[PDB]
Every structure is written in structure tokens, then in C-alpha cells.
Design a protein around this ligand. Structure first.
Ligand SMILES: O=C(O)CNC(=O)C(=O)O
Ligand SMILES: [Mg+2]
Ligand code: NI
Ligand SMILES: [Zn+2]
Length: 331
């Protein structure tokens, strides 16, 4: 078995290997990458996502989210308070202000220490989940707005034609902005490209060990667990690496820099934070190997998780027994 310790693998495809996206995902899996839950892909030196980032400041962040924490430093939840709209240029200035800017630090490890020590005492503002793309239309390789759609994959594998579309999302981050422990909707893959700015640190649990994380989460968030049998679908809970180590939960960590891709694999729990002002783009995708994960994915039916239009068909076709309860949660 390849990669039996479930380490995060880093890949350096050549320009020729960068042509066929599906084939390269399948290559990475042949080497065991999926066992970690997360892989890094460094594009060939010949590649670029677009010519410059000099003209992005007029993009609108219609609903910036202030991420307010409750709990203790290593075990907390966050809620998202909606703020007034602002442009990317306005947001960048805010991120660079004395109130929100990254503190002086020695290296990534020192900054990680400061994050876990101090995150709860601040409420950074995240421009998340903004439909759109920063890839040039002429970029033909690993262009996250030109991938094969998950609807087409389901149709190719299973023969059923379904409604729905699949488009990318932009994320504008600042110091301490946080993504809570989650897997993707319907335990899909994700791909994330860091277009510009400061790094993003990731933490990930191997898919084969995801239920260990879930069991710890039910212990650590006992009221939430009683409210919903899939409350990590709410995307609000954080658990530090120190706490994970104290409870014997297998995980790995890595820092993504500008110009790098990350791929999350089906049922790979992940969480993380941004180091400073940055912009990422991400999208869900599927492969043939996903179908069995989609069929077994947990679902939130309590009403909190509320998701896209396009998840309806996935639940309806892959999980018909769960469909009626899940849809009641949607309504
Ligand atoms: O970058 C973020 O804030 C969160 N991204 C993801 O969870 C992802 O790409 O799957
Ligand atoms: Mg602009
Ligand atoms: Ni994700
Ligand atoms: Zn729920």
C-alpha cells in the first residue's frame, strides 16, 4: 500500500504532465496521496494563472464576515457576523491596518504559535465564498473555472442526467481568518489555488481516520452534538494541534504559499488559517473514486448547514433514503 503513514505529499508536475487534470489526479492517488486527505501541487515554472494582479481592487465583497470566537484557545467555535460591503481595495487596506495586520514574527512556526495562543481574542474579517474566478480565460492548464463538472461526472459514471452547475469561489483573507474543521459537501474533492499574498496554514485528518475526529468533536462540543448528528457540516468548530495530539488524533499540517495548489480528498477533514492579506480560489470536483464517498456522506438535516442548489440532485440520486429528511432541513 502506497503512503501507509498518510503523509502529505508534494508534487512537481512538468508542463506536459500539467495538461490533463484528471490523469494527474489519478497519478497522485497511484502514489498514495489521498491517504493524507490533502496534497500540494507546485505548478511547472512555465505556468501562470494570469498576467498580473494589479487590477483586482474593484471586485466587491458584498458580505464580509467578522469571525467571532467563543470557548478556550485550543477549543472554540466561531460565528460569522455580517458587515457592510466593501471593495477588495478597501478590504486590503483594512487587513494592513494596525488593528488587523500580521504581528512581527520569526518564521511560520512562530506565527502558528501566536495564532493558537491569541486567535480567540480578536475578530478578523473574511471575504469568503464570492462566486467568481481570477484565472485568465487563456490559461488552459489547471484553470479552476474550466474543470469538468460534478454533474457531468455523475452522468458519465452512473448514467443519470441531473440539473445543477459547479462554479468557483474567491476568498479574500487577513491575519487570523479561519476555516473550521470540515469535509466538503457530499465528501467531494476540493482544489484551492492561492493567487496572491500571504500564506495559508492547513491541518488535515487522513480519511481513514475521520471518525476519530468526529468522536472527539462530539466530546468537545457536547451541546452541538446533541443538536445535530453531523454538526461539523455547520463549519464552526476549531480544535488546535495541541488538543488533537493530547487526544491521539492522527493529523498533519502544511503551509501553502502564493502560486501553489492544494487538493483535499474525499472525507479528508481540514481546517486552517491565513497569515495576512491574501486571495484564494477554490472549487469542488469529483472523480470516479468519489462516487462511493458521496453515497456514504453524512448529512446535516437540522437546518443549520444550508447549501447550494446543486447539492439537491446529489442527495436525491446518491442518498434517496435520506432525501426527504435532508430536504426538510433545507426548507
Ligand atoms: O481557504 C479557505 O478559507 C477554505 N478552503 C477550503 O476549505 C477548501 O479549499 O476546501
Ligand atoms: Mg477590479
Ligand atoms: Ni474545504
Ligand atoms: Zn445540523
Amino acid at each position: 500500500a502506497q503512503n501507509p503513514n498518510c503523509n502529505i505529499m508534494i508534487f512537481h508536475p512538468t508542463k506536459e504532465e500539467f495538461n490533463d487534470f484528471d490523469k494527474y489526479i489519478a497519478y497522485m492517488e497511484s502514489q498514495g496521496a489521498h491517504r493524507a486527505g490533502l496534497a500540494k501541487i507546485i505548478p511547472p515554472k512555465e505556468w501562470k494563472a494570469r498576467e498580473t494582479y494589479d487590477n483586482i481592487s474593484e471586485i466587491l465583497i458584498a458580505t464580509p464576515l467578522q469571525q467571532v470566537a467563543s470557548g478556550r484557545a485550543g477549543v472554540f467555535t466561531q460565528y460569522h457576523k455580517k458587515k457592510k460591503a466593501m471593495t477588495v481595495g478597501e478590504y486590503r487596506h483594512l487587513a494592513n491596518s494596525k488593528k488587523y495586520q500580521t504581528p512581527p514574527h520569526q518564521n511560520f512556526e512562530d506565527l502558528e504559535r501566536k495564532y493558537w495562543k491569541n486567535r480567540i481574542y480578536n475578530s478578523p474579517i473574511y471575504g469568503a465564498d464570492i462566486s467568481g474566478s481570477l484565472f485568465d480565460e487563456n490559461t488552459k492548464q489547471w484553470n479552476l473555472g474550466h474543470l469538468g463538472t460534478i454533474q457531468d461526472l455523475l452522468e458519465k459514471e452512473c448514467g443519470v442526467v441531473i440539473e445543477g452547475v459547479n462554479t468557483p469561489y474567491l476568498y479574500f483573507g487577513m491575519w487570523k481568518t479561519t476555516f473550521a474543521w470540515h469535509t466538503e459537501d457530499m465528501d467531494l474533492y476540493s482544489i484551492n489555488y492561492l493567487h496572491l499574498g500571504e500564506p495559508k496554514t492547513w491541518y488535515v485528518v487522513p480519511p481513514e481516520h475521520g471518525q476519530r475526529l468526529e468522536r472527539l468533536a462530539r466530546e468537545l462540543f457536547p451541546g452541538s452534538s446533541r443538536g445535530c448528528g453531523a454538526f461539523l457540516r455547520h463549519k464552526v468548530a476549531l480544535i488546535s494541534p495541541t488538543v488533537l495530539k493530547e487526544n491521539g488524533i492522527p493529523f498533519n499540517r502544511i503551509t501553502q504559499e502564493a502560486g501553489e495548489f492544494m487538493v483535499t480528498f474525499p472525507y479528508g477533514y481540514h481546517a486552517g488559517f491565513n497569515h495576512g492579506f491574501n486571495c484564494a480560489e477554490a472549487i469542488n470536483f469529483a472523480t470516479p473514486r468519489w462516487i462511493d464517498y458521496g453515497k456514504m456522506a453524512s448529512q446535516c438535516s437540522c437546518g443549520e448547514a444550508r447549501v447550494t442548489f446543486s447539492m439537491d440532485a446529489f442527495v436525491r440520486i446518491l442518498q434517496p433514503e435520506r432525501y426527504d429528511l435532508w430536504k426538510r432541513g433545507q426548507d
